């Protein structure tokens, strides 16, 4: 930064600019940063609370905080989100610009029950972004602490901490320890400000479209194929006795199912089906026991949300995959709630290309039939990738994560975040912030020991983030109208996506991007 | 077009030019276009014939016709096909040029049983190609209606129609309706002609070679490995009692199966085995019941032909996969025939890299053995892709489809048409053609109602299509002779791939591209 | 036109181009033109059918036809209409381009019950547009005969005819007679084509927005005015006796109605209220008797639809103004139908600025009160314009008229078509078309008499019209989502705005432009 105490270090700019094929969404917020761990790095482990072999962990908690803006509703208003999803077949991020400014560091003293807060003008904060991706990257794990959806809210910066390898609650030899004061970081007083600019690597557009066709129906309904299939292994029964014969027909309008096809549905990893009407569910706890989960190094980790698959079948609304959806809270919901409080997203738009998450991929022959032996088949619950598969990624939601970091590995298959958004090798850097320690008066005779005695203080200020988004226009020749995301129209006690009488902003429903349709 | 009634709008050119590494195959045909649906767009659905939940559909039938040239024998004579497959390791399309010309529109009137046909000189046809891929793409579904194999035949243009999303026999909200008079289309009288040129996107060469080695045999037979494997978990029995011991040998000439390898066979999705000798098949109808089929949105769709896999084992000719082959008709075969009438293709050339379609991929251990517990394994009927798999695509046949359109999706795995040919994001555009309506005399007092009264008329003309193909030469150092595609040699009542006494052209057998061999 | 018989005189182009702030909508149709009045100009009058003093008329019917493209659905598909109304605050026409081409003139002869139709190559049609507005302008009267909504339909050109001044069924001295062969007109054979280009005069954008505020509520709810009003003419009663006093309060949050305001609702001309539930209506025929109608030269003409006013009150959906709405037919509705067959439009979006069509404008004091005299007031059913009135024009609908011609008069007040659309001093010219007479063989000895003997013939061809529209973008800062025009979403037997099984295109509902909101 440049000037001194009585000069503001940056303006409030929160806006959205729709120009041509791009949109630039700027958002500004006010934040508050406490002092974490009394300026201490501490190791954390599951030893303190026994938990279970699956939940064991080992790691470190740091005094540093961090800035999270990895949810769309940070950058989008409900109206701006509506322009996007109604008018466009896809979008991707292009550029990023981050700013801290108008920094204030307060000192707080407690005497005789009365708490007093005063400006500390000479105290600093430390801020650095990790550009080289050297620290553990905890973004993209869909935690709390992101900038709020509503510009008028004030949010508290979350604490930074990370996990590493472990054996039980202990640490193995490969466990890493990172001191974050071992990086260069800019130190800022009230006149100083912080900024950096970032540029997204090239990624495919998100698909904001739903298919208007299905794989199995891509044919011409009027015309008959020139390819035979095997229709019958017996002669047409007259009610007397079946006689062995091989009969071949041509796929045609009459029978589409038997007709030949070039393509196959996407892969599935199956999951249990749960009903929203309680009396239709089994009486037992199958949530963890009957769960679909993957086994890694003796740990069973639930598969959530998992491979993208349609949530329910054509006519069945009430069923949902046990682990196979994203679930959001309604406003004023605790960390433990019932079905009425949650907001539950479903992917019904991927039914054309994708299996239903709660049902089989297909069925496959298990044996070699003969004259005495009868044909047997087995059900395919899980299927990996086969040549000729097509699928869709999970949808992105106004409340959902924007990106996640692709791990650094020898290989990956079609990397995309299974929660949603844009897989990135070099995602937006983590921004880390801390209150610099201010010692309380030292003893006046030299002792080597650690101080532990500090002035309790916190800092506040504003942060603005600006992302440039690229749009993919809708080319469709469809005659009839599209589906659109609309407002309620009929009267109601309060406006959706607006504050109530008490001042509490709320988002009544999740909103996905897939409305406009295109051919498959 | 340019000139008037009595001037021909284009020459007949049907030929093939083999030059260097390319071949240019031009083919001309004569066509006839009727009037479909009495100039009406009509919705079609399975409601009219109940069928079954798997065969339900919803869609639209259009007055428009379309040109199909998506089979090799359109562009290739049996001799030209023989030069290709004997001399070359691969081929791919490069350029495309399409022409309509010599257009004639006849009016037909029926009085007192006598049908009279006359030229209508002022009537037009409408032709447009969809360059932007905005309409449902029904090509690549292997329907009839393509240009005939034999240049002297006349073919009738098929009717255009498409399917969209449905719930049962009804339409959901995403069902699309396309009016094809909502595109710009060129209107042509007898002097006018139509042309456009297309350029194929870059695709890999088809493999016209068969491997001369197998994955498991890629080793050196003379030399012994330096890698141990676990040969025995007991001591060599003397006929007294087995004793626990671990014994390691080196893979060598003696035991190749136990020897270590870098690669794995391609993925499989298994299918039932059917015998061409009727008495060896089970007595039951397993065709649909014992079928291998995939489940998509509550519909069971047969998997045909499916993932490329060898049709039968080494010595077993008579068995074939239930759904796992392409099947062609002999001349004069109905839409329902027995085994003698069909022409059945097999892939035996992919036995080196690919599983047998009718048998297991492998076997895998199902449990953790201990002192009391005995080792158990389970059979792998289906396998998705694993690191280190190699496979071959299904072969292309003189009768088979050339290309198919890769769907527009977020992801796909090794897209290739499972029927065969070249997967294309931007395939050759659909060419759509229609007879422009000519109204019968109007009533002479104004009524708003739809006419429904038209002059019955049809159009004929010639169409030529020219594709430029790129060739991949045979580099082999193989000493001994290759296998080749040869003619019969011995006498027979009639020439193969030639007309009979009655004038009916016929193709006696399917012909694939894989003859010449190369190392694996 | 240029070339001869066997060369098409123009291409089919039907499309829509959305570029920046403009949209260019081209539409092509096929038409059929009969021979009207056996080539005769005939006078028409109400003398033939007595009717009533209000319905008397005098005029002329002409052999000429005319082209009508004065409805939006000619130029807009239901999807293109949806892009417009969802994304924009207004639109107006800019340019116009009209084309006739591919002309065909058929001769038709009837012998012994068999009707024969043949091309007549040397026969012509006559086409002229009236650029100087010299003929009676019958467009904008919302008649039938316009190009159909659906491009695949064929329409018959309506007959041209006009009315002039009359006394009863007779003609006064100012009655005008127009011969349309007294204008220059282009004569076209099958090779010839017709074209002209037109440019709309500058008009205000249509308002495609609904107001998000009302006139009476424009104030600040939190703050109290500095202006007093007279609250009470008696002292606050204690239950004993009222005492004369004058008391003044300040308009504030509590009482908004009494608060001072700068503006007034638009003018009203009142109309009767009819309920869609039959049992709530009076039992009588009040349709014509209780109608709202204006009296001009001894004729009572119904006021339809009339001055723009909200159709119903806030909570009352079922009521509608007797004459005060536009009413459309469902497909397959006769010229006499019941309530179920009609499609009825309502303006609820003008409730903020406009009176309810079925209720009073206001109430006004009728007398000078004194000590003995009590205050009296009268209801205002009709109100002309007052200083400080604001209002909204009636909405435009996909089925409704685009423009109407402002009469040429000494004065007008806020000219806009009361049906809807754009008032134009110089609207798009009338295009007039006729089949040129071809005489049957003359008698071979000279007679002066009129022929009356002609070859019966008709003509067909294609017509394309292209309008360039200018758009007004949506600038709103509104946080929450807008209302949008959406598709059905839930399943149904057939797609809306699409053909049925029989081929009949239908529009299920009327669609207005007002969805997006802006402040008042």
Author numbering:
A (entry chain L), B (entry chain B), C (entry chain C): 218 to 737
What does the paper behind this entry write?
Adeno-associated viruses (AAV) are single-stranded DNA packaging viruses of the Parvoviridae and belong to the genus Dependoparvovirus. The virions of the AAVs are composed of non-enveloped capsids with T = 1 icosahedral symmetry and diameters of ≈260 Å. They are assembled from 60 viral proteins (VPs): VP1 (≈82 kDa), VP2 (≈73 kDa), and VP3 (≈61 kDa) in an approximate 1:1:10 ratio. In this study, the structures of the AAV7, AAV11, AAV12, and AAV13 capsids were determined by cryo-EM in an effort to complete the panel of available structures for the defined AAV serotypes.
AAV7 belongs to clade D and is closest related to the clade E members AAV8 and AAV10 based on VP1 or VP3 amino acid sequence ranging from 85 to 88% aa sequence identity. Compared to AAV8, the AAV7 VP showed different surface loop conformations in VR-I (1 aa deletion), VR-IV (1 aa insertion), and VR-VII (1 aa deletion), respectively. Greater structural variability between AAV7 and AAV2 was seen in VR-I, VR-IV, and VR-VII due to single aa insertions (VR-I and VR-IV) or a single aa deletion (VR-VII). The glycines on both sides of the apex likely confer the flexibility of this loop and thus the cause of the lack of structural order. While the VP structures of empty and full capsids were largely identical, some alternative side-chain orientations, e.g., histidine 230 (AAV7 numbering), were observed. In the AAV serotype structures determined in this study, the histidine side chain preferred the “left” orientation in full capsids. In contrast, both orientations are equally adopted in empty capsids, except for AAV12, where the right orientation appears to be favored.
